[PDB]
Amino acid sequence: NTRTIYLAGGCFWGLEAYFQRIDGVVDAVSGYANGNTKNPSYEDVSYRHTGHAETVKVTYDADKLSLDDILQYFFRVVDPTSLNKQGNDTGTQYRSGVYYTDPAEKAVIAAALKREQQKYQLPLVVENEPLKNFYDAEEYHQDYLIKNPNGYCIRKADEPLP
Numbered sequence: 001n002t003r004t005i006y007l008a009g010g011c012f013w014g015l016e017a018y019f020q021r022i023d024g025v026v027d028a029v030s031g032y033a034n035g036n037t038k039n040p041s042y043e044d045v046s047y048r049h050t051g052h053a054e055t056v057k058v059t060y061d062a063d064k065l066s067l068d069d070i071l072q073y074f075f076r077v078v079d080p081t082s083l084n085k086q087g088n089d090t091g092t093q094y095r096s097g098v099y100y101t102d103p104a105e106k107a108v109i110a111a112a113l114k115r116e117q118q119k120y121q122l123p124l125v126v127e128n129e130p131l132k133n134f135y136d137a138e139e140y141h142q143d144y145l146i147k148n149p150n151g152y153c154i155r156k157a158d159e160p161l162p
Contacts, residue, residue: 002026003062005070006033006099006131008053009078011153015056017145018077022157024064029057030137030144033099034127036091039135051091055099057134067105069161071098071112076156080116080126089125097127099134106130 009015012030019028032040035052045052060070080096082089089095098109109128117124136142145151 001062002059003067004057004059004101005067005105006055006057006101006134007070007074007078008033008055008095008097008099008127009074010054010084010094010096012054012056012137012141013144013151014153015054015077016143018154018157019056019058019073020143022065022073024061024069025058026061027057027059029059030141031055031057031134032137033134034097034129034132035135038133042138042141045093049091052093052135053095053097054093054137055097055134067108068112071109072161073157074098075112075116076159077154078126080113080124081120081122082125083122084125095127096125097129099127099129099131101131 016028016030019025032045032052033055035050037050040050040052044050078096100106
C-alpha cells in the first residue's frame with residue numbers, strides 16, 4: 001500500500017512543498033533526523049549543533065511510485081555535491097541524505113546514487129544511512145509554504161519519469 005522514505009536536501013520548507021505536489025505522494029512531514037539529541041526544537045537544530053538534518057518524511061503509494069521514482073524526483077531538486085554548502089556537511093542542518101527504514105532500500109539507494117554520480121563531474125556527498133532518529137518539526141513548520149507563499153528558499157515535479 002504505502003511506503004516511507006526520509007529525505008534531507010536543504011530547507012525542508014521547500015522540499016516538503018515539492019513532494020506534496022507530486023502525484024502518488026500521500027504525505028510529506030518536515031522533521032529533524034539523525035542528530036545526536038532527542039526531541040530537538042528548531043532553535044536547537046539551527047543554533048546548538050544537535051547534528052540533526054532538516055528532513056522530510058515522504059509517504060507514497062507503492063502502487064503508483066517505486067522508491068526509485070521518488071529518488072529521481074529527489075535528485076531533481078537537491079544539490080548532492082559539496083557545492084550544497086561550504087565545507088563538510090557531516091552533521092549539518094542542510095546536508096543531503098536518504099535515510100532508510102528497510103534493509104532492501106539501502107541497495108536501491110546505493111545503486112541510485114551510483115547512477116546519479118554518472119551525471120556529475122564532482123563526487124556526490126549524499127548520505128545513505130539508516131534512519132537513526134526522526135522528530136517531527138513544530139506544527140508551525142508543517143505546510144509552511146502553503147501558509148506562507150513567500151517564505152525563503154518546483155515545477156520539476158510536473159516532469160514525467162523515465
